[PDB]
Amino acid sequence: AKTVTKQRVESHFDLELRAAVMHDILDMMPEGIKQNKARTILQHLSEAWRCWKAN
Amino acid sequence: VALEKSVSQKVAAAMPKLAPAQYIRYTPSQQGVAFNSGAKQRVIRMVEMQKDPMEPPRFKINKKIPRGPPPAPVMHMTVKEQ
Amino acid sequence: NMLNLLIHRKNLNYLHLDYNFNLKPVKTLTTKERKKSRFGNAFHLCREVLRLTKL
């Protein structure tokens, strides 16, 4: 067991955001049936987040 | 009641004495009349061995072995959609 | 005797415990030896309490 902590918080929040989106949407979006763009949809996520950081 | 029993065992760790002499009567499965002196049964007095209170944990538990493996039946696309 | 047995138990042959409970090292230590030889507060606390009683 490991306890959330200051060193780990930013990593933690993004970890469980990637998981939040992954579970939600791949249990939400589907019918690709094979693998639906999980790597890709998440890359769209990080891309969008960078874009909003760059305005 | 059942849960409480279980809990007490777990809690035994947190709180670091047994005195029962208990007898048992045994029937073997070999028999044959020359196997014992010549008794269909034997009797054994079971005694719990006394543990040395300053004895450290004897042996090492850390070792790790991969999780073990039937699925219930499930019972539950257009080109354009694809 | 306890503390020497602990020391030996771990094969720390380059430490030396004297009779007034000062834990010293025999030789200048190698990096690896230094890692392995550290005791935590539990051992040192015990050692110092014993020192007090020996006084």
């Binding site: - | 777990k10 760790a13 947190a14 944990p57 538990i61 | -």
Partner: protein, 96 residues
């Protein structure tokens, strides 16, 4: 195969369970209550309370500050992090 290891956190604490009391709001009271009436009357009371509560001969410019009554920008809550009024205030304060 249960380890003799321990930890500080694990030790006893709050071994007693605080059961709710009668004035705290034991389930007995709750079962008997007609909540709907209570909720209505409280609501009414709240409403009532609310009701009770409520020269220079020379210049470029004639008055700019005519009808400028603040506006409800701090009454609007906005679900948008960069256009919330809180964010504006923060941005105003900390950058030069």
């Amino acid at each position: 195969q249960l380890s003799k290891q321990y930890s500080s956190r694990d030790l006893p604490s709050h071994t007693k369970i605080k059961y709710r009391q009668t004035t705290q709001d034991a389930p007995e009271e709750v079962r008997n209550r007609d909540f709907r009436r209570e909720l209505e009357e409280r609501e009414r009371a709240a409403a009532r309370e609310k009701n009770r509560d409520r020269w220079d001969d020379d210049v470029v410019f004639k008055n700019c500050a005519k009808g400028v009554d603040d506006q409800k920008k701090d009454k609007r809550f906005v679900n948008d992090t960069l256009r919330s009024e809180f964010h504006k205030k923060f941005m105003e304060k900390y950058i030069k």
